[PDB]
Amino acid sequence: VPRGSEPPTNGKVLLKTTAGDIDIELWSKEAPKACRNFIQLCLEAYYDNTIFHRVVPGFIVQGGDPTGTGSGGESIYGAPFKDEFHSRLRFNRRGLVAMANAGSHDNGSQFFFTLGRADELNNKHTIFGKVTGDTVYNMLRLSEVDIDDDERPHNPHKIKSCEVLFNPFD
């Protein structure tokens, strides 16, 4: 049993992006609100044709804003929803999927992938999924971009489509 061993995932989403396919396994037991939100938005096409508008080298690449501006996007709930943390879901490696926010209990639609560690985000951002080992390279390629001074890529990568491969709420 490795240190930092994570609970089993349940739920799978496939993003078809301009950097390749990215396969996300979901922690639906530990972060049910975030997982339900992500699945439903995925199903409703809400993430289709959306950009990855923010890249911080070695830290995060962030997307999920239907406006592409960095400030838009809303949850399925009619208001931003609560954080969901778990002591076994930690920012101790690259390839995790977490919700963006601008404070406590402020989850909307924007989410990000971790490009490195981000321990300082532990207990601040909901971690709701992880990228499969065999799609991490494509996830990292989202960050392989020339960037402006507001962390915006000159030519952002995009999600063409999102599909739910296994829906744990069915």
Residue numbers in the entry: 3 to 172
The publication says:
Cyclophilins are peptidyl-prolyl isomerases (PPIases: EC 5.2.1.8) and are characterized by their ability to catalyze the interconversion of cis and trans isomers of proline. In order to understand the molecular basis of these results, we sought structural coverage of the entire human cyclophilin enzymatic class. We determined crystal structures of seven human PPIase domains—PPIC, PPIE, PPIG, PPWD1, PPIL2, NKTR, and SDCCAG-10. All cyclophilins share a common fold architecture consisting of eight antiparallel β sheets and two α-helices that pack against the sheets. The active site of the cyclophilin family includes the invariant catalytic arginine (Arg55) and a highly conserved mixture of hydrophobic, aromatic, and polar residues including Phe60, Met61, Gln63, Ala101, Phe113, Trp121, Leu122, and His126.
No binding was detected for PPIL2, PPIL6, or SDCCAG-10, making these, to our knowledge, the first set of human cyclophilins that have been found incompetent to ligate cyclosporin. We were also able to confirm that under the experimental conditions we tested there was no evidence of CsA binding to PPIL2, PPIL6, or SDCCAG-10. Three cyclophilins neither bound cyclosporin nor tetrapeptide: PPIL2, PPIL6, and SDCCAG-10. It is clear that these three proteins are quite divergent in the active site compared to PPIA. Perhaps more importantly they are, along with PPIL4, the only isoforms that substitute the residue Trp121 with a non-histidine residue. The molecular function of the PPIase domain for these isoforms is unknown, but our structures suggest that these isoforms could still serve as proline-binding domains. Indeed, our assays show binding to the standard substrate suc-AGPF-pNA even where we do not detect isomerase activity. There are three distinct classes of conformations adopted by this loop: the PPIA α1-β3 loop family, which includes PPIA, PPIB, PPIC, PPIE, and PPIF; a shorter version of the loop represented by the structures of PPIL1, PPIL2, PPIL3, PPIL4, SDCCAG-10, and PPWD1; and a longer version found in PPID, PPIG, PPIH, PPIL6, and NKTR. For PPIL2 and SDCCAG-10, both of which have been found associated with spliceosomal complexes, it may be that it is the non-active surface of the PPIase domain that performs the major function as in the cases of PPIH and PPIL1.
